[PDB]
Structures are given as structure tokens and as C-alpha cells.
Amino acid sequence: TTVVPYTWNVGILSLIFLINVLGNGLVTYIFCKHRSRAGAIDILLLGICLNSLCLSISLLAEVLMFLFPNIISTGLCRLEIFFYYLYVYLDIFSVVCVSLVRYLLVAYSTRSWPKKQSLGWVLTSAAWLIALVLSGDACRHRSRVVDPVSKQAMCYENAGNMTADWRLHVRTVSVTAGFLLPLALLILFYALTWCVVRRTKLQARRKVRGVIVAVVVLFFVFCFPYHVLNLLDTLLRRRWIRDSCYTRGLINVGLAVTSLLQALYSAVVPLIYSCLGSLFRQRMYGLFQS
Prior knowledge:
Elements: H1 6-33, H2 40-67, H3 74-107, H4 117-138, E1 143-146, E2 153-156, H5 163-200, H6 210-222, H7 224-237, H8 245-276, H9 278-288
Antiparallel strand pairs: 1-2
Helix pairs in contact: 1-2, 1-8, 2-3, 2-4, 2-8, 3-4, 3-5, 5-7, 6-8, 7-8, 8-9
Main location: host cell
Protein name: viral G-protein coupled receptor
Transmembrane segments: 11-31, 52-72, 81-101, 119-139, 177-197, 211-231, 253-273
């Protein structure tokens, strides 16, 4: 059985695509118009918008394949899954980079190099290269297959006699490289920032930045559930926890619910900037008053 009907899934993904594209395109436009006077964390926060825009192509492809089964082909199956994994890796990598740069802003406060655009660009490129490698590795075999039992085409993991091995390998790579290690690095950098602040008893000149914290919190809100349920699913398919029809159906429902949350983070991200950021709020308010 399928948990979310066709109509609900298509509508939700279409609305998410619309808001994603509009919000992150506008944010990137404003950022490119005011680039010259930006900092490292500004570049990272723009990188989050670029990550969200990656998902737009994936969702557009998926929606067009739903609407038009006729155009389902190997090329679209590759492209959709490529952009999907690109988004999934890039979001967590960008959060890790944000944590790294705030660590560096305190570890090297006496230096000026932690606060330049150069650090943001270097970190963004380092994240993008890794995400591209990981996504391209996964999107190699997904092609057009026809089920004998229903005589309809669909995107599938067909890889020959080794289809199951590839199916397991892709999920294992996703879990290990896109949830576990990035989370450990994130925790490490925040713990180091807190430790260095505690050890120095840094003065009250430290004052909170509204935008940075909200995005990091809403990431753990809208995206973490999908990754944890993916980990549970992969544990099912590796027989590290016990099999059961009830458990399988429970996780089948859960994956359906949480996958929509993770896609909704793309729409959530630009709205955080449009309200908690003074520059984005002003500019977008002026644009919308036109």
C-alpha cells in the first residue's frame, strides 16, 4: 500500500517547489546585489539558499514524471535523484560549515582572516565538491524499468543481477556520509566553541545574531526526523534489528510523513531570512510593495 495519495503528494511537492524557488531566488538576488560588503557567514547563509534551489529541479522532474508517465526515461530518473541527493548532502554540509566558522570566529578573534568572504567561499566549494561526488556516485544506475505485474514504467535501481547490492549500497552511503559524520562534526564544532568561550570567560561583547540560530534550529526540526527514520529503515534492510510486518508498515508510514518535512525545510529557509534579517526584510518588503 501507499500512505500518501497521488493528489496530496503532487500538490504538496508543487507548493513546496513554488515557495522554494521564489524565496531562495529572491534571497540570492538580494545577496548578489549586496555581495561586496558580505562576510563568511553571509556566504554560508547564501549557500543554504543555493542548496534549497538544488531541490527545485529534483521536485520539478518528479512532478513532471507524475503528471506525464510518457516522458519517464533514464535521463530524468538520473537527474531527479542526482539533484535530490545533492540537496540532502548540501544542507547538512552547510550547517556543519556554519558551525565551523563560528568556532573560528572565536578561536582566532585577534585575526582578521576568519571574517572575510574567502573563508566562506572556500568552505562552500569544499562542501559542494563532496556533495557532487556523493550524488553522482549514487545516480549512476537509476533507469527506466517496466514491472511485469502492472505493465507501467517507473524509475528503479536496475543494475543487473546486483540490483539488491546497489540498492543497499546507496542507502548505506547516504546514511553514513550524510547523517552520521556531519552530525558528529557539527557537535564537535559547537562543543569546541562553547569550551573556548568557557575557558576564556569571554566578555559580554558577545551578542546573539538572530538569523544564524533560527536556521540551525529549524534544520533539526524539519530535516532531522527524515534522517533518523532513514537510519532506522537502513537498519531494517541490514537485519541489525528484528523483522516484522507491523514494524515495516510503521516505518513505511513514517518515511512518507518525514520526507515531506525535509522538503518543506527548503520553503522554510527563505522565510527565516525575510523576517529575522533586517536587510532581507527591508528589500523584500520594498519589492513586494511595488
